[PDB]
From a paper:
We report the discovery of a parvovirus with a bipartite genome, Acheta domesticus segmented densovirus (AdSDV), isolated from house crickets (Acheta domesticus), in which it is pathogenic. Our structural and molecular examinations revealed that the AdSDV packages one genome segment per particle. The AdSDV capsid displayed an overall “smooth” capsid surface with the only protruding area surrounding the fivefold symmetry axis. The AdSDV VP subunit displayed the canonical eight-stranded jelly roll fold, complemented by an N-terminal βA, located on an elongated N-terminal region.
Cryoelectron microscopy (cryo-EM) micrographs revealed that the consistently high genome count of the FC population (in the range of >1015 genome particles of each segment) is indeed due to the presence of almost exclusively full, genome-packaging particles. The interior of the FC was filled with density attributed to the ssDNA genome. The slight amount of genome-like density of EC capsid interior confirmed the genome quantification and EM results, namely that this population is heterogenous and is composed of EC1, EC2 and FC capsids (detailed by Fig. S7). The EC, EC1, EC2 and the ORF1-VLPs monomer lacked two N-terminally ordered residues as well as the unusually elongated C-terminal tail of the FC population, making Gln366 the last ordered residue. The AdSDV fivefold channel displayed two distinct conformation states i.e., either an “empty” for the EC fractions and the vpORF1-VLPs, or “filled” as observed in the FC population. In contrast, both EC populations displayed DE loops pointing inwards, narrowing the pore from 16.0 Å (FC) to 10.1 Å, with Tyr159 and Ile152 retracted underneath the DE loop peak.
Numbering used by the authors:
A (entry chain A), B (entry chain A): 49 to 153, 158 to 366
C (entry chain A): 102 to 153, 158 to 366
D (entry chain A): 49 to 101
Write the structure that this text describes.
């Protein structure tokens, strides 16, 4: 009988999200950096640098100066999101220079080696790791391992890309590893021992990394003393081998022939935040999983960086 | 020459938003309320209630208890947005009951008047207003004007919809009023004297509302003592007449025949937040306009609620 | 959410379906729940009117029974005794379907001779797993499906997580490893309410005369024709909340968000 | 008027079986037996055995 405009017998209506909301933010970090193999101290040496993409360094947490609204967006979107899934992490190194330190007498001058390249090793085929102590240590310029190289005179175990200056090196990862409608519970990405999604089932006893690195996840969540959630998933295995930046090993009269690279390293980490529903539901933690991370009191802690995953034909 | 995978001579690349990002949040507020014309005090009287949609009450600021993540979403999205545009404001009143207070002896009993209706007046055709003192005053249950009715025995000046119980009354507004790529500068919608977008060019001298109510906007922004922005737009005019809820005026033996309505009032305010760019740009205020609002020291302040806008055929 | 589908709220409501179930549980090694059909019929909507003092009841045909799903909220059901399972007396303090501030409930609205039906899919299990039978004689046992939320006070166990891990004694000599993937379920709190209508005195009081019909489809997988105690290997303990707790809180999670790949 | 989901004016409904239910069980008995006509006593004799079906 009601004659008004846009009036209808009510259906079943409650308008609240029910968790169906999702936001895609891209945290992106772009740096023109000094990659220096010349110096004798503090990760300036011939030692091949390491890009700790296995770690949450994608935030640029190596330094606070590199914060940007993408982090701040992420941070906020984490407060208002119950869970997040990482989509694709796009790393692009641009080489703006290749520079050699030449010796004359004594002191050195730097000359342009355009015509040489920057080496990007994947450190596949080896079981190796990244020590992580402080977020500073995450700096891919100073991050090193002793007695380490991309070049072995005996068995050269590294698959090494080779980059001319204005040639660009891009890579992309799929962090979509999760399924069964699970997510990752948000953090601000403010720790260096948290790691990217994907399962490197290797974990040290010294720093138990936990169930998030195994295909079959089992974990609990306090989320209050009264209730506890059982988070169980199947997440495909990932390898994420150690990615190094190196100069060529070239034997000068004196010693290894020293270079320094001026690069720009661009990151885009696609993050789909699944927003807290329009009504309080603390139990959405049920679907989230703790960020994959390595725990323990250890000051220095070793990121697994497994070479690869073999495949079997059925 | 560079042989690596996914390598190409760089193009012009900086990855930062440049303001192109936008988020659509819907602040939605859903209340099962007591709409009471029976009482003798404090907006419980025969006086027709007013839905102050002209005001920012869409937040539900009438009471803090009605806060929800949509506000909290909005609040955050306002911190990280340089400007916002309102899209469509969907108001839906559901009537779950129509109740009359019958007199017996003395005391009253309430009986179901299913078969009568709730009146929604638009108070068009009249120049009338809404006094707003406190956000509480925004409550559409208690919000009233003295010597006021939807029924004049002489000239009945109101276009009054009439709502059966389980019939629903819905309305929608277009707050897209702005153009020339202008936005509104965000607020948390935490004030009752801020008003919806759209131009009611009427403003009192007592409380200058300002240029946002005129088609041709002119205003300045401090945004630092060093720089100032000139915000100038053309925004189509809006009317937004006073929307009242009323009971029928029915003369019992004693006096006006008293009812009370149990309704649910649902709001959806579509808000497209335009996110702060990935790099600091304080001058995006240049494109935003102050939320339309009525200023001044006035404790009580009158919302224009113009009836309509005449049209001329060229 | 509870095993009240048996009608365990009262013994008087036992019927051959239970007795059938009971027996079929003795002779079945495992059971899978199929579909649980709940139908509320409203035969009356009645208001208590005040006169003077004492009350009379008048027919409010023209008002409705509210069925809330209590979605969008994290809420629970305290369960102490099977009696407490009675949907007539089962309540939470300071609780309503109506909030003057944010109304968080999706509430169906039922005329008298209109009927409210719902159906659940308890087929949650897979990998050829079942549930190990019980007579459904406990109130703290719960329906299949995974609400991963469990209190520390009453550990509910692995049956509420997608990835199940549990062991079975089934004799001191052998033990079974039961491991599954069961899709997640929400099963939000389902309330019956009257409208909140403010009379002169106080909230305006109603009473509903309803009929509530339940059908719980149960496929019993019968004990094989030869003794095989190890079929427990495929069964999983009925999902339940353990612990010494007298009162115990059923999770009743609102919902489950979904992510687009 | 009732707007809820899966709601309809009731028909005549009582859900009880009314005896319409039936179960087929097969009792099956399988034996590797000694059928002996040799012995001199207790049904072991030349006497033809009987299957008391």
């Amino acid at each position: 009988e009601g004659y008004g405009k846009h009036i209808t017998s009510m259906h079943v209506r409650n308008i609240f999200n029910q968790g169906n909301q999702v936001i895609r933010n891209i945290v992106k970090q772009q740096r023109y950096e000094l990659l220096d193999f010349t110096g004798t101290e503090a990760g300036t040496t011939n030692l091949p640098k390491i890009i700790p993409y296995q770690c949450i360094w994608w935030r640029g947490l190596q330094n606070a100066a590199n914060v940007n609204q993408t982090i701040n967006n992420m941070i906020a979107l984490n407060t208002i999101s119950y869970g997040v899934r990482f989509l694709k992490a796009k790393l692009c190194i641009e080489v703006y220079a290749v520079t050699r330190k030449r010796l004359i007498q004594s002191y050195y001058t730097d000359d342009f080696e355009q015509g040489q390249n920057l080496f990007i090793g994947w450190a596949d085929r080896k079981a190796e790791s990244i020590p992580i102590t402080t977020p500073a240590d995450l700096d891919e310029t100073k991050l090193t391992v002793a007695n380490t190289t991309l070049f072995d005179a005996n068995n050269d175990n590294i698959t090494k890309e080779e980059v001319p200056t204005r040639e660009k090196w891009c890579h992309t990862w799929d962090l979509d590893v999760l399924n069964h409608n699970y997510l990752w519970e948000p953090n601000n990405l403010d720790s260096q021992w948290t790691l990217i999604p994907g399962a490197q089932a290797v974990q040290p006893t010294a720093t138990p990394i936990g169930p998030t690195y195994q295909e079959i996840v089992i974990a609990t969540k306090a989320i209050g003393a009264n209730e506890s959630a059982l988070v169980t998933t199947i997440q495909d295995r990932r390898s994420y081998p150690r990615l190094m930046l190196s100069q060529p090993q070239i034997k000068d009269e004196t010693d290894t022939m020293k270079f320094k690279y001026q690069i720009r390293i661009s990151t885009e980490l696609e993050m789909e935040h699944h927003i807290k529903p329009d009504i309080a539901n603390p139990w959405l933690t049920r679907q989230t999983l703790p960020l994959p991370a390595l725990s323990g009191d250890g000051t220095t802690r070793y990121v697994p960086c497994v070479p690869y995953e073999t495949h079997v034909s059925q």
